[PDB]
Design an enzyme around this catalytic site. Structure first.
Site, mmCIF file in Angstrom:
data_model
loop_
_atom_site.group_PDB
_atom_site.id
_atom_site.type_symbol
_atom_site.label_atom_id
_atom_site.label_comp_id
_atom_site.label_asym_id
_atom_site.label_seq_id
_atom_site.Cartn_x
_atom_site.Cartn_y
_atom_site.Cartn_z
ATOM 1 N N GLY D 30 15.795 74.153 -31.900
ATOM 2 C CA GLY D 30 15.852 73.201 -32.995
ATOM 3 C C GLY D 30 16.517 71.875 -32.681
ATOM 4 C CB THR D 31 16.639 68.888 -34.909
ATOM 5 O OG1 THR D 31 15.461 68.101 -34.692
ATOM 6 C CG2 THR D 31 17.778 67.998 -35.367
ATOM 7 C CB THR D 32 21.244 68.463 -31.568
ATOM 8 O OG1 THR D 32 22.593 67.992 -31.696
ATOM 9 C CG2 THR D 32 20.371 67.413 -30.880
ATOM 10 C CD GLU D 47 17.225 65.018 -32.139
ATOM 11 O OE1 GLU D 47 16.111 65.081 -31.582
ATOM 12 O OE2 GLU D 47 18.261 65.452 -31.593
ATOM 13 C CB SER D 75 20.077 73.455 -35.425
ATOM 14 O OG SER D 75 20.905 72.303 -35.438
#
Lengths: 198, 242, 111, 244, 241, 243, 233, 244, 250
Positions: D30-32, D47, D75
């Site tokens: 996943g996105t941070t 993000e 995330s």
């Protein structure tokens, strides 16, 4: 209250039941049959609250007929009456009880003895030589206490009923429009068609 | 094993797909839609000459203006028909009118996906999909004569003509050529009877096939054996003529 | 004890002509000897060329009108935008009312 | 033998629940997103990958408020994250209704902890596909938390999860050493923006959007609010300058 | 609690649990039904794996559902009791509400419906039973004979047989039953039934039972001798040739 | 066949692998703990390991205040630990409400042991990967240590230890009790009992501790409490002025 | 590998994937193409309807939810029926209880949450349909994309279904034009019809083949089919 | 989920048999033999105790012969505990019948009902069947003395003589060989013992390895008596028939 | 959530075995030896307190448990399983008997109830059989003294004397040689203490052995006086001191 009478003689049980159906101000019917055949040798007469009456009768009828088919056998009058009693005793403590009184007249083909059971809406059962529900017994029980014999013939029992009906037609305030009479013996259940001018 | 509502890697529901294979093995059914009415015909397909053919009920009434034919596991159709009759009669009780054919079909198709071992949505209590397809035909004031094909997937298509069951691909290609917007009911009757004859494994007669129609005026009627027999005389003669 | 009913007074009137119909009502809303409003509309356009009024206990009146409006919305959804004929509305209203047979909407309704 | 990893509540021979560990893989995919505790509050940031120009900017909001004082970011599988906040919101409502006072952050953390832990107890449910950073202000100060798919959580000074967790975690470690006297809310907002710019390097293939929120006793009156307009631009600028 | 889908589709479009339910029928003792002009006759075979039974009290193979309708079956005996009970209950309920006994078709539709239901409900397996149901509609004197199977499919038959070696006896019946001229007598109808059964039973005095159903609740099961008389007369038709 | 290792059904050898692997999970945190009895106190020491600098050390605990009187230390992962803690608190509260006195240490142990037994028998519940050590000064039995495991087993102890180096710590303690010939630490002040506990922890593990490498809980008449970092530092200073 | 972890939605793969969810997504790409796009005054849905035979009807792809909201479907139609019906209810509950038209954004959140439950429990299955939601509320025109994974996303334009990448590229390129196509409904639809055709191959888009829906400032959500879309071909 | 661990106890084999029933019957075939013989003036129940020891208290022991009613008794072949579950519900059904009708339950009605319970475990519920076969010995005023048998399939049949448990093939041969319709109880007692004596998997038939029951219309009353024989009583009857 | 295991986990194998019951019995074999002997005026049950550590307090773990004032139980196999069965056994003795006839149940009937609990765990959905065998000793007015064995299947049998667990076969044999129908209670305690010595490996004393009797009434263990008809439990655990006093004359 309808007239519901029963008398047990030597070889049979006889049930007399009033023909009137009255709602409020009007006699709606004068030919009502207040009776259900439970099995070929067992008959039930009934009186009480307007709807509960036929609903309960037909419900007992359904149950006995089911039993007959499952077992290929006819339950004894005693067994049928105990079944009916338990049903009424359940009913008395339910949300809306069946307000129905019954007479059960059967011929026990095993013993060869006639049987008469009186059961009220509370599930109070008693076996009797003769019985009645409602006000009927107030006039009839003393006639029968007098003229009844255990060895009477069917013809003798019918004369005794005729007397009872005559007393009811003299002293009772409601016109119950005569009775239908039925005999339960070794051969089954038949209806006496000639009681209007016997 | 595997859940009854599982997707294949191609994004199809296994149990629904396998249900379609069961449909393929069923007796043929055909419907034609015309401006004079909608005809429904089926293949009785008795499994033995000792079977009394007229006791095969594969065309049923739903309401006066709606009938349907089935193909596949026909035993599965009973509770679908039952739901269908209830939906139509109920609508009339609630609204003092006829249910629209499209609405009735959608109601039946609502049952279809109500299978599973407890699916998180509403209560779907049914162990498997239906193994029968349905041709539902009828008439209403808004949208005229209509024919629907209702699958155990829950989807339903409207057709000018449609064939379902064992001979469907063959019958469908034949319907593709024969159908036009100016058939008469009589033409439609003959056409169903003809195409059934082609795909049937017996020699078509008034015993082993059944016709029916729905018209605005007379509603849904199943043709008795005498009437169908005459249409068969008639089709045999019009083909022999050229 | 708690009494779930009141009376907001209020009178309505429907007359059908040959190619028209009217549903009229006064605009007064009351409780006992007080006026609650001199202008609280009580006759509503329900769509599909249907007008409705449920006169009596206002809270019951409002629920019924509200619930029939929502019935028209769903009729459109469930039956491909079909116009709800007046006779069909009537029958639908019967069921709405009779559904509360043992705790009635205390209103006299005209459409 | 094998097959220990096919069912949720099952101990592998080495005392592990593989299904939970597989969920962790979905998180790392996943996105941070990050959390920075400060001298009187907490700052959250994440993000947001611009999959397409067609995404309306500033619209697909990912940070979620619980009650009025708690922020949550995550995330992994976004739907799973939402599910957890819904439960968190019910869990807060229930606490407030009975005890009047808004839910203390530690107390809130355990409510989420037990619920997530519950989804590792049976084979009829799947574990959560998110790691969730959350916190806020209460009666005795600021609290930051991170909660793993296993139901594991701890209090943090700074927290990071997702594709660029290492980069972020490195940067966070620097601040803890260089500021033992305790970052401010204002500085943490800037710093947060930087950390996300620096974890974007481990995902630098698709452009991105920055999203900050904070909860500060002096700056937000203890209430969770999003960073918008002038203060958001200033933080992007502070970051965009130190990327060069 | 238990709701596992046991009857499910396989890739070739079959429901294996229903299919195997048929295999249990093929394993049951043979049963046959033939309709006359004014009667219907039901015949069933008895197994001889174990013989030392008490015939008085051993449940026989033909069941009365009401006084005018009878049911017989091939397959799992235990499964059939459940269907018999539900049919008997429905018969009484029908009389109670409609004030008329069931038609034979209605009763058949009921039993078949029950069987179908057990093919698409979680937690249950289908009935290992196929049934023959016969009798006369109230006040009709047209004889009636229907057959149901584990799938819930039903239909009426001039004559039909089910169970082990029904393929054999169906063959017999297919070339011995003329639809133009049903066995116009009770007697010749009982004969045709015993004949078709003898193609399979191979020597059956105590192995064949017969029930005769005529209109207006006229149902009677024959005794060994009354059956044995039919066995004697049939074997002498061969030997005189 | 092979599924007798996924759910808590018996294996042909009459074993429950899921329970056995639950025992394996109890050492996942790589921490040792030990418990001892004073004259009128009960001490629990547990290693404290804060690897990550980003953590808030004050929230990293494996000791739990179950009630005013009962403390519990857990060996095993924190999520299962907290699950057990929540339940034991709810049980201790309920017991008080229904019976009008404080739940005894042994009774709560039994209750938790019974709950674990259930997961052992019913297939839908997994065992918790934890060992629970319950400590108190019971109003009837005096200082008390009761310990439950994922098998549903439980028993009272004179002293005990749990964790990867359990055996080392156990024998160490056994050796002290053979010598002293008594079943507790003859010391009036909990401070010296804490000091004893830390000392024998060091001897058996061959490791020196700072104030942040341990975690201490003490149970007295009518309280259970945990020591602060500075409280522990005070303890560590005293042991040094002896060696 | 894959063989062992795609049995149900309740199982994670060793790389953290949910295969049943991915398979459900596959049902969408097999579905006929649909497009959504919006300006600041209107939102439009353009859908290509697909038939079975030349005898069959073209199956409807656009469903109305409220006077200000509706959606287009690609994948399993019955799952579109279930979800749009839930949306009709939520829109309805908002009007009855609060006298409030339901925010498109919030409808998005509800759809996400309903789909999510079906991806975490045994016995259930993910939805097998993608949805494009358009609506006009108190913050203007809106377009949302729903995926059975539970991911809902707000966009100026998008497309889902077979060969959807054509229209989506076109829309990305046309972005600065159509976003301004305010006060002019016919032109917005034209920009949609030109978007959908970038995914054509088998066939042109015909009269009984095209399906158009429009919502906006003073325009209730309405569906156009047949003769009504003829002027856009 | 759970499905993985479901044995599926109520399915058909490809051949149309019921796995769990067949395997249950297989279990019963290893149980001590039980025999019922019906005479003209009564019924005999004889059963062999599977496994014994010097220390088994046979005085207080009961494992094969149970009183259901005053007019009905059973002999058990299979799982004792499984049988006790069924015995208890059978006893209740009898009392329910008596309460409802004021008449003792006809033998078949009770047998049919127990067979129906058994049948259920065969078709729904996902549970294993009871590993039990019963010989019922009873009297009613409709049919007199009756002998029935029921097994895990829930099928039941009536018998003049029959055996369940171990060595039934051998035992049936011997009963069929010596049984006659005009048998008297005393002869039937002898037959029951002789048969067991020739079929035992043990050395010789001693008293401490048997259970014995008679149901007789004892000519001194003109009412039906259930006799469950004592150890000394089995010891005696064993001597008279010449097995000592 | 929700227990969805509504199917049996114990099923018949083609050989007719019930696997899980067998496996439970195997677990019982691993268990420490326990035994019961019936005398003419008493019963004795005994087992070994296998201390899992010398730091553990063996007294706090009771393997012999009172069920009613006249009934005790001992076991072999899984201790935790036993402990829950003892809880349900005490409760069922009340709910199904004392609360209905105002007296404690007779041994055979309390046994019957326990046996039922274990049978259910053999058949009910989502469970495994209990991994224990019980030995239940008791007295009641109409039956006198009586010893029963209950197994994982839920089967039970009356014994004059028996043993279960590790050294059952060996100990059963030794009991056969020494048992007669004339033993006094002390005679039986002695024989029990002899039988148990062959089983233990290490220390053999009143702290390792747990042993209880069902004997005479104990008015001193009642706690109150004044009802002449209550004369005191027949169950009694022998103290550590009581064991050693007899081990000296061994």
């Amino acid at each position: 209250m309808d007239i519901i009478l029963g008398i047990r003689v030597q070889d049979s049980v006889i049930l007399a039941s009033s023909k009137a159906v009255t709602r409020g101000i009007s006699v709606l019917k004068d030919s009502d049959d207040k009776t259900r055949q439970l099995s070929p040798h067992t008959l039930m007469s009934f009186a009480g609250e307007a709807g509960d009456t036929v609903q309960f009768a037909e419900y007992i009828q359904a149950n006995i007929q089911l039993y007959s088919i499952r077992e290929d056998y006819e339950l004894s009058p005693q067994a049928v009456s105990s079944f009916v009693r338990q049903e009424l005793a359940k009913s008395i403590r339910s949300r809306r009880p069946y307000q129905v009184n019954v007479l059960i007249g059967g011929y026990d083909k095993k013993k060869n003895k006639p049987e008469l059971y009186q059961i009220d809406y509370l599930g109070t059962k008693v076996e009797l030589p003769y019985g009645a529900h409602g006000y009927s017994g107030f006039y009839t029980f003393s006639l029968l206490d007098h003229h009844y014999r255990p060895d009477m013939t069917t013809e003798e029992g019918l004369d005794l009923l005729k007397l009872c009906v005559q007393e009811l037609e003299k002293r009772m305030p409601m016109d119950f429009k005569g009775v239908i009479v039925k005999i339960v013996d070794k051969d089954g259940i038949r209806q006496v068609d000639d009681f209007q001018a016997q | 094993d595997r859940g009854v509502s599982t997707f294949s890697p191609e994004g199809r529901l296994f149990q629904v797909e396998y249900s379609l294979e069961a449909i393929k093995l069923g007796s043929t059914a055909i419907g034609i839609a015309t401006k004079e009415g909608v005809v429904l015909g089926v293949e009785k397909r008795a499994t033995s000459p000792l079977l009394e053919s007229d006791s095969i009920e594969k065309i049923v009434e739903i309401d006066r203006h709606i009938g349907c034919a089935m193909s596949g596991l026909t035993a599965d159709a009973r509770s679908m028909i039952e739901h269908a009759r209830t939906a139509a009669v109920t609508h009339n009780l609630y609204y003092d009118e006829d249910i629209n054919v499209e609405s009735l079909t959608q109601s039946v198709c609502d049952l279809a996906l109500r299978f599973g071992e407890g699916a998180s949505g509403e209560e779907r209590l049914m162990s498997r999909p239906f193994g029968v397809a349905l041709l539902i035909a009828g008439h209403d004031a808004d949208d005229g004569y209509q024919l629907f094909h209702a699958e155990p997937s829950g989807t339903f298509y409207r057709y000018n003509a449609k064939a379902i069951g064992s001979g469907s691909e063959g019958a469908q290609a034949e319907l593709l050529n024969e159908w036009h917007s100016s058939l008469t009911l009589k033409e439609a009757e003959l056409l169903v009877l003809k195409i059934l004859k082609q795909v049937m494994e017996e020699k078509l007669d008034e015993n082993n096939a059944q016709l029916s129609c729905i018209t605005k005026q007379d509603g849904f009627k199943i043709y008795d054996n005498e009437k169908t027999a005459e249409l068969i005389k008639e089709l045999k003669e019009k083909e022999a003529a050229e | 004890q708690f009494n779930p009913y009141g009376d907001n007074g209020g009178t309505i009137l429907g007359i059908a002509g040959e190619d028209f119909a009217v549903l009229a009502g006064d605009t007064r809303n009351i409780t006992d000897y007080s006026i609650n409003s001199r202008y609280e509309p009580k006759v509503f356009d329900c769509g599909d060329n249907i007008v409705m009024s449920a006169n009596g206990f206002a809270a019951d009146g409002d629920a019924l009108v509200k619930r029939f409006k929502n019935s028209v919305k769903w009729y459109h959804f469930d039956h491909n935008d079909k116009k709800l004929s007046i006779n069909s509305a009537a029958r639908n209203i019967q069921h709405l009312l009779y559904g509360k047979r043992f705790f009635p909407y205390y209103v006299h309704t005209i459409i | 033998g094998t097959g220990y990893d096919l069912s949720n509540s099952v101990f592998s021979p080495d005392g592990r629940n593989f299904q939970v560990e597989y969920a962790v893989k979905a998180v790392e995919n996943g996105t941070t997103s990050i959390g920075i505790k400060c001298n009187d509050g907490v700052v959250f940031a994440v993000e947001k990958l611009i999959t397409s120009k067609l995404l309306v900017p500033q619209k697909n909001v990912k940070i979620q408020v619980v009650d009025r004082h708690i922020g949550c970011v995550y995330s992994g599988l976004i739907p799973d994250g939402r599910h957890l906040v819904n439960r968190g919101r019910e869990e807060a409502a229930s606490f407030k209704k009975l005890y009047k006072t808004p839910i203390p952050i530690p107390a809130f953390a355990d409510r989420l902890g037990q619920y997530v832990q519950a989804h590792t107890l049976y084979n009829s449910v799947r574990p959560f596909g998110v790691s969730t950073i959350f916190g806020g202000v209460d009666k005795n100060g600021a609290h930051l938390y991170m909660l793993e798919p296993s139901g594991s959580y701890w209090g943090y000074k700074g927290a990071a999860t997702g594709k660029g967790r290492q980069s972020a975690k490195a940067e966070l470690e620097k601040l803890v050493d260089h500021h033992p006297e305790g970052l401010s809310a204002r500085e943490a907002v800037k710093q947060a923006a930087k950390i996300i710019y620096l974890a974007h390097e481990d995902n630098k293939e698709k452009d991105f959007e920055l999203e900050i929120s904070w909860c500060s006793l002096s700056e937000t009156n203890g209430l969770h609010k999003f960073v918008k307009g002038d203060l958001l631009q200033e933080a992007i600028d502070f970051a965009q300058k130190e990327i060069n | 609690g238990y709701d596992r889908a046991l009857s499910i589709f396989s890739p070739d479009g079959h429901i294996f649990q229903v299919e195997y339910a048929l295999e249990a029928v093929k394993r049951g003792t043979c049963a046959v039904g033939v309709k006359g002009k004014n009667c219907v006759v039901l015949g069933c075979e008895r197994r001889s794996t174990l013989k030392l039974q008490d015939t008085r009290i051993t449940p026989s193979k033909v069941s009365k559902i009401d006084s005018h309708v009878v049911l017989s079956f091939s397959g799992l005996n235990a499964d059939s009791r459940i269907l018999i009970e539900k049919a008997r209950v429905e018969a009484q309920s029908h009389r109670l509400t409609l004030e008329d006994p069931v038609t034979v078709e209605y009763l058949t539709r009921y039993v078949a419906g029950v069987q179908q239901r057990y093919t698409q409900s979680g937690g249950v397996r289908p009935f290992g039973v196929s049934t023959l149901i016969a009798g006369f509609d109230p006040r009709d004197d047209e004889p009636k004979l229907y057959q149901t199977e584990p799938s819930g499919i039903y239909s009426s038959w001039s004559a039909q047989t089910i169970g082990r070696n029904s393929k054999t006896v169906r063959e017999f019946l297919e070339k011995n039953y003329d639809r133009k001229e049903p066995p116009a007598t009770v007697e010749e109808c009982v004969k045709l039934t015993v004949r078709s059964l003898l193609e399979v039973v191979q020597t059956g005095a105590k192995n064949i039972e017969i029930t005769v159903v005529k209109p207006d609740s006229d149902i009677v099961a024959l005794s060994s001798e009354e059956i044995n008389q039919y066995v004697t007369q049939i074997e002498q038709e061969k030997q005189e040739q | 066949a092979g599924y007798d290792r996924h759910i808590t059904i018996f294996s042909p050898e009459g074993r429950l692998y899921q329970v056995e692997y639950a025992f394996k999970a109890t050492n996942q945190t790589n921490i040792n703990s030990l418990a001892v009895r004073g004259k009128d106190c009960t001490v629990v020491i547990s290693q404290k390991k804060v690897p990550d600098k980003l953590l808030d050390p004050t929230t990293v605990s494996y000791i739990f205040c179950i009630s005013r009187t009962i403390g519990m230390v857990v060996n095993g992962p924190i999520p299962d630990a907290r699950n057990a803690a929540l339940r034991a608190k709810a049980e201790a509260a309920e017991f008080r409400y229904k019976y009008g006195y404080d739940m005894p240490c042994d009774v709560l142990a039994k209750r938790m042991a019974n709950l674990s037994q259930i997961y052992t028998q019913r297939a839908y519940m997994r065992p918790l990967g934890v060992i629970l050590t319950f400590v108190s000064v019971d109003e009837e039995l005096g200082p008390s240590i009761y310990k439950t495991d994922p098998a549903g087993y439980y028993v009272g102890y004179k002293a005990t230890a749990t964790g990867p180096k359990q055996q080392e710590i156990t024998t160490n303690l056994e050796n002290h009790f053979k010598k002293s010939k008594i079943d507790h630490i003859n010391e009036e002040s909990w401070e010296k009992v804490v000091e004893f506990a830390i000392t024998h922890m060091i001897d058996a593990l061959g490791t020196e501790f700072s104030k942040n490498d341990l975690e201490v809980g003490v149970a007295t008449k009518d309280k259970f409490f945990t020591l602060s970092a500075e409280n522990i530092e005070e303890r560590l200073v005293a042991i040094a002025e002896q060696d | 590998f894959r063989n062992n972890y795609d049995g149900d939605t309740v199982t994670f793969s060793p790389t953290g994937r949910l295969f049943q969810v991915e398979y459900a997504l596959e049902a969408i790409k097999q579905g006929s193409v649909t497009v959504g796009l919006r300006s600041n005054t209107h939102a439009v849905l353009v859908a290509l309807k697909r038939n079975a035979d030349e005898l069959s009807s073209y199956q409807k792809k656009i469903i109305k939810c409220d006077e200000h909201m509706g959606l287009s479907l690609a994948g399993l139609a019955p799952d579109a029926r279930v979800l749009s019906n839930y949306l009709r209810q939520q829109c309805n509950y908002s009007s009855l209880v609060f006298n409030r038209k339901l925010a498109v954004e919030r409808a998005g959140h509800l759809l996400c949450d309903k789909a999510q439950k079906n991806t975490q429990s045994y016995g259930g299955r993910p939805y097998g349909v993608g949805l494009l939601i358009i609506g006009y509320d108190k913050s203007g025109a809106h377009l949302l994309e729903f995926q059975p994974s539970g991911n809902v996303t707000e966009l100026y334009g998008t497309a889902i279904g077979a060969r959807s990448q054509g229209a989506k590229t076109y829309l990305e390129r046309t972005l600065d034009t159509f976003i301004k196509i305010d006060g002019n409904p016919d032109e917005l639809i034209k920009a949609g019809v030109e978007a959908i055709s970038q995914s054509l191959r088998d066939e042109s888009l015909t009269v009984d083949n095209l399906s158009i829906a429009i919502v906006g400032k003073d325009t209730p959500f309405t569906i156009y089919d047949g003769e009504a879309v003829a002027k856009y071909i | 989920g759970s499905r993985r661990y479901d044995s599926r106890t109520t399915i058909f084999s490809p051949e149309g048999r019921l796995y769990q029933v067949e395997y249950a019957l297989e279990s019963i075939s290893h149980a001590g033999t039980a025999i019922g013989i019906m005479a003209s003036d009564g019924i005999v129940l004889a059963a062999e105790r599977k496994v014994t020891s010097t220390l088994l208290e046979q005085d207080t022991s009961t494992e094969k012969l149970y009183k259901l009613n005053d007019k009905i008794a059973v002999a058990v072949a299979g799982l004792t505990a499984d049988a006790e579950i069924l015995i208890n519900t059978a006893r209740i059904h009898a009392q329910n019948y008596l309460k409802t009708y004021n008449e003792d339950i006809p033998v078949e009605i009770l047998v049919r009902r127990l067979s129906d319970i058994k049948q259920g475990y065969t078709q729904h519920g996902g549970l294993r069947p009871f590993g039990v076969s019963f010989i019922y010995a009873g009297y009613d005023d409709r049919y007199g003395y009756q002998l029935y048998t029921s097994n895990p399939s829930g099928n039941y049949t009536g018998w003049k003589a029959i055996s369940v448990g171990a060595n039934t093939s051998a035992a049936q041969t011997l009963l069929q060989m010596d049984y006659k319709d005009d048998m008297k109880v005393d002869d039937a007692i002898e037959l029951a013992l002789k048969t067991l004596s020739k079929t035992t998997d043990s050395s010789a038939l001693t008293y401490d390895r048997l259970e014995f029951a008679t149901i007789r219309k004892g000519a001194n009353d003109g009412e039906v008596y259930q006799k469950i024989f004592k150890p000394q009583e089995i010891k005696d009857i064993l001597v008279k028939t010449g097995i000592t | 959530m929700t227990d969805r295991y509504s199917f049996s986990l114990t099923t018949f194998s083609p050989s007719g075995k019930l696997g899980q019951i067998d496996y439970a019995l195997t677990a019982v074999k691993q268990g420490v030896t326990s035994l019961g002997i019936k005398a003419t005026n008493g019963v004795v049950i005994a087992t070994e307190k296998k201390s899992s550590s010398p730091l553990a307090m063996s007294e706090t773990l009771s393997k012999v448990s009172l069920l009613t004032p006249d009934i005790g139980a001992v076991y072999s196999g899984m201790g935790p399983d036993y402990r829950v069965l003892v809880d349900k056994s005490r409760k069922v003795a009340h709910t199904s008997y004392k609360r209905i006839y105002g007296e404690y149940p007779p041994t055979k009937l309390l046994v019957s109830e326990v046996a039922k609990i274990m049978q259910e765990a053999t058949q009910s959905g989502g469970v495994r059989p209990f991994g224990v065998s019980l030995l239940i000793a008791g007295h009641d007015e109409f039956n006198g003294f009586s010893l029963y064995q209950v197994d994982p299947s839920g089967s039970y049998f009356p014994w004059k004397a028996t043993a279960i667990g590790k050294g059952s076969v060996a100990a059963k044999t030794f009991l056969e040689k020494r048992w007669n129908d004339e033993l006094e209670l002390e005679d039986a305690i002695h024989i029990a203490l002899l039988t148990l010595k062959e089983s233990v490996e290490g220390e053999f004393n009143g702290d390792t052995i747990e042993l209880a009797i069902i004997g005479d009434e104990n008015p001193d263990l009642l706690g109150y006086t004044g009802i002449p008809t209550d004369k005191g439990p027949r169950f009694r655990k022998l103290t550590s001191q009581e064991i050693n006093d007899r081990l000296e004359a061994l």
